[PDB]
Amino acid sequence: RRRRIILFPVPFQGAINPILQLANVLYSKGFSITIFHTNFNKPKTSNYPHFTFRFILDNNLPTHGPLAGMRIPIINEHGADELRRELELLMLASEEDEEVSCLITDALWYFAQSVADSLNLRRLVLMTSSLFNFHAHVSLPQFDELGYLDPDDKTRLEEQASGFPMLKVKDIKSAYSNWQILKEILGKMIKQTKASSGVIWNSFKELEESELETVIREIPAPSFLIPLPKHLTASSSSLLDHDRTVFQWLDQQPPSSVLYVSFGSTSEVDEKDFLEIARGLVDSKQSFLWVVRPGFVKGSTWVEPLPDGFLGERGRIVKWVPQQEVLAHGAIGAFWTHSGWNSTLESVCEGVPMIFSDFGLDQPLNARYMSDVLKVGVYLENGWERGEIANAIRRVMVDEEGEYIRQNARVLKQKADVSLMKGGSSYESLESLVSYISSLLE
Ligand SMILES: O=c1ccn([C@@H]2O[C@H](COP(=O)(O)OP(=O)(O)O)[C@@H](O)[C@H]2O)c(=O)[nH]1
């Protein structure tokens, strides 16, 4: 292959997944692929015989928990010299007829821009969160001087934000609840994304059409929107063993009778709220498949606080599944999600309507957009209460009053499918991306 692309993900599941989906999309278009990766949380290299892996940067920190994410600031602050040596030696060791076209990194690797610059290597960024999230980010000054960033101030919560009517004030509070902490790294990510040679968004035009103008205005480099879950699932980059019972169980369930439930990799709840969630599921009387990661419940290894047989025959709790493949199964009627972007987009691409909870960061923004703009789910935006949970589940899955949500999800899946076909917005965006990358050396 004449042209090689180097991709460098952040080593967590929700960041590895889109990068390796993109790597496959680019390999399909004729590029050779080198993955730079930490030894930490490395994927199964034997699932990618067509890729070359080069392990870097970590050849005392915990492997799990919120402290695991400390690797990202540390590598941003201390990895430049090593990344440069690794990039330069690969650039030098290339075949006579081969050329390294560009580096693609997670936007969170803001340190890679100066490194790539110093080698005259173009860097493109893969955004793993939405255009709407970015639009909210760049509106933070206007939020600030309206005081919305004031955790000890608790007013106008249910009001729409002025100048940003798609959001409520509480959404902004929740999303930027750690602002004073994160404003530094957030600012660096945005700066070095704007300074990049191109931004790839895991999205599609018909999903976030209200946001395109913002990214054209705010980012000089070209933007490309590609809905990676419509190209392929992320099953090959799973860091955990998929549960081997769920599909046999799903085959025993009537169509659209199952609520899939997963609250995310790092989310955490009190025992009180955990039990209230369980009560709401039982009260809904719907069948459910619930992925609970060990540690989800404060103070318990897994799901100890659940009483024996409390979930009855209608429910299953597992630790890990191939999520997009589950969402594609005919038994699934709805998805109760924490509103992480991969999960939300997977559900959209499989046409599954959603019930939304959130645990901060971009999740409240995703829930608000999907529930109020697209109207493909119900946002539980006032905590955990068994009656409200049961009503939301049933509205999406059973009630005739929720038909519009179910139909809106079906229509949006069809729009994603159309965007991939020749002539569609995603197809042409990918065509532009391939031509752009191919042009970078001339
Ligand atoms: O049992 C599970 C739970 C999650 N996922 C995948 O893990 C990723 C989770 O990313 P997301 O952005 O939704 O949220 P996070 O867990 O990073 O907060 C998605 O690709 C899911 O399909 C999976 O394959 N199986």
Numbering used by the authors: 11 to 69, 78 to 460
Give verbatim lines from the article.
UGT76G1 is a UDP-glucose (UDPG)-dependent glycosyltransferase, where UDPG is the sugar donor and UDP is released after sugar transfer. UGT76G1 alone performs β (1–3) glycosylation of Reb D and Reb M in S. rebaudiana. Our data establish that UGT76G1 can transfer glucose in a β (1–3) manner to an existing glucose A at both the R1 and R2 positions (“ends”) of the steviol aglycone. The enzyme UGT76G1 shows an unusual degree of plasticity in substrate recognition; it is able to transfer a glucose to two different ends of some steviol glycosides despite having a single active site.
We have determined the structures of complexes of both the wild type and H25A mutant of UGT76G1 with UDP, the wild type with UDP and Reb A, and the wild type with UDP and Rubu. Asp 124 forms a dyad with His 25, suggesting it could play an important catalytic role in relaying protons off and on His 25. The H25N mutation completely eliminates the activity on both R1 and R2 sites as judged by MS. A trace of the product can be detected by MS in the R1 reaction of H25A, the kcat value of such a reaction is 10–5 of that of the wild-type value in the steady-state enzyme assays. The inactivity of the His 25 mutation indicates that the same catalytic machinery is responsible for the sugar transfer at both the R1 and R2 ends. The structure of H25A shows that a cluster of ordered water molecules occupy the position of His 25 and form hydrogen bonds to Asp 124, which might act as a much worse proton relay for the trace activity.
